[PDB]
């Protein structure tokens, strides 16, 4: 009765959201997956085919499906140039300007499925040879595939190869980082109440590897694991304990990490290290809150931001923008915050949330589970959400610059 009368809410506002894109948005791709995806990463490279307004960008996907055929999923989304003529074909329309027909919009196509043992509860690509991707299952193990040592058409067998078999946990998790300054460094968090770490870097890639090392500061489900970007022995946890911690891989002590803070006053979902900014992180927890971090300074939050509805699961930082981050969960929402606008003044346009929100992305109508910053076209964001709709997106230049 309850999710009836959201639901009949959820499509009264979702109206209103279709209505107002050509004024919000320079960019709204919308696509029904096979499957719901947990998880979403951008791949890092692009193709600008020699002749033509578009380019070929590649994301990481994955399957939810409680029968037996999961696949580890990438798919090719063709997104406008820099340089290219501004038409309806960007709000998915190919209605021609003076009559008649205008443009087709850009095509999402499945490029490559590979069987998967159970749901993908995330996959992430390996920054040194974004090839090889690591999942989060649920039998507890991580996966290594490396997607050019299978065929782009699944085996009908319904076996999974996977090139490695990371053990070490006793349950699932969704957590997973691997290290951008020690290739084949590979962290994950898990329902166990441990982090495990791999290194990769020396074994051949379908044999099994054993944690090198084991970290046991949390005393409940780790939600979350991150790397620091620049310091390639410091990495950050978050957990269902509230803690976000803070590990150096040079201590002895697997048990205690560096820094303790109570960061949340809620479960601890997920965290993001600025790629700028070497001393800020951001938290996000089932308080509704984003929390604004110094490592410099741990005792003192430096920020809550606030508007969420519900639990969030992910936080990210802009690849492009230093101040600018984005929090996504079951509010069906995804927010974008940006750090400078914090303290202004604003004309109650202060009746629909505090300065430093910049936009909220309405377009989802079920709860978003991952996001991705498409690393080489400023300000696209790529959401995916439990009803299987995955967007493709970009708010209006006017709303940033």
């Known amino acids: 009765f309850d999710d009836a009368v959201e639901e009949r809410v959820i499509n009264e506002e979702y109206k209103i959201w279709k209505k107002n894109t050509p004024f919000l948005y320079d960019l ?3 696509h029904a997956l096979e499957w719901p995806s947990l998880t979403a990463q951008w791949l890092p490279d692009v193709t600008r085919p020699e002749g033509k307004d578009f ?7 994955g399957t939810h499906t ?6 580890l999923v990438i798919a090719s989304v063709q997104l406008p140039n820099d340089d290219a003529q501004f038409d ?5 329309s190919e209605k021609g300007e003076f009559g008649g027909f205008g443009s087709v919009s850009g095509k999402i196509e499945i490029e490559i499925k590979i069987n998967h043992e ?10 040194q040879n974004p090839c090889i991707i690591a999942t989060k299952t649920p039998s507890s193990d991580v996966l290594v595939f490396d997607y050019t040592k299978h065929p782009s058409k699944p085996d009908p067998s319904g076996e999974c190869n996977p090139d490695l078999r990371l053990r070490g946990h006793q349950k699932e998790g969704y957590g997973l980082s691997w290290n951008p300054n020690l290739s084949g460094h590979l962290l994950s968090a898990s329902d166990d109440h441990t982090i495990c770490l791999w290194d990769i870097s020396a074994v051949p890639k379908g044999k099994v590897v054993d944690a090198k090392t084991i970290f046991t500061g949390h005393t409940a489900v780790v939600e979350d694991v991150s790397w620091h970007l620049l310091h390639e022995s410091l990495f950050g946890s978050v ?10 891989t040079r ?9 303790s803070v109570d960061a949340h006053t809620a479960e601890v979902n997920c965290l993001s290290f600025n790629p700028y900014s070497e001393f800020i992180l951001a938290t996000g927890s089932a308080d509704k809150t984003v929390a604004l971090w110094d490592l410099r300074n741990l005792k003192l939050k430096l920020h ?17 923008n230093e101040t600018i981050l984005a929090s996504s969960g079951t509010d069906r929402r995804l927010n974008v915050w940006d750090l400078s606008k914090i303290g202004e003044e604003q004309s109650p346009d202060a009746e629909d949330g505090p300065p430093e929100l910049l936009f909220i992305h309405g377009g989802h109508t079920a709860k978003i589970s991952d996001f991705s910053w498409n690393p080489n076209e400023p300000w696209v964001i790529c959401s995916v959400s439990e009803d299987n709709i995955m967007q493709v997106w970009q708010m209006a230049e006017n709303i940033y610059n």
């Not at 201590?251 to 820094?259: D, G, L, R």
Request: glycine share 2%.
């Open 118 to 127: 159970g749901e993908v509860n995330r996959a992430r690509y390996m920054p």
């Open 251 to 259: 201590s002895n002590n697997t048990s205690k990490p560096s820094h």
């Open 88 to 92: 309806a074909s960007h709000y998915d």
């Open 66 to 71: 409680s029968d037996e055929q999961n696949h």
């Open 239 to 248: 957990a269902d304990d509230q803690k976000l911690m803070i590990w150096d």
């Open 304 to 320: 809550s931001f606030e508007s969420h509805k519900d639990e969030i699961f992910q936080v990210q930082w802009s690849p492009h």
């Open 55 to 61: 380019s070929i960008h590649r994301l990481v996907l």
């Open 28 to 30: 709204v791709m919308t």
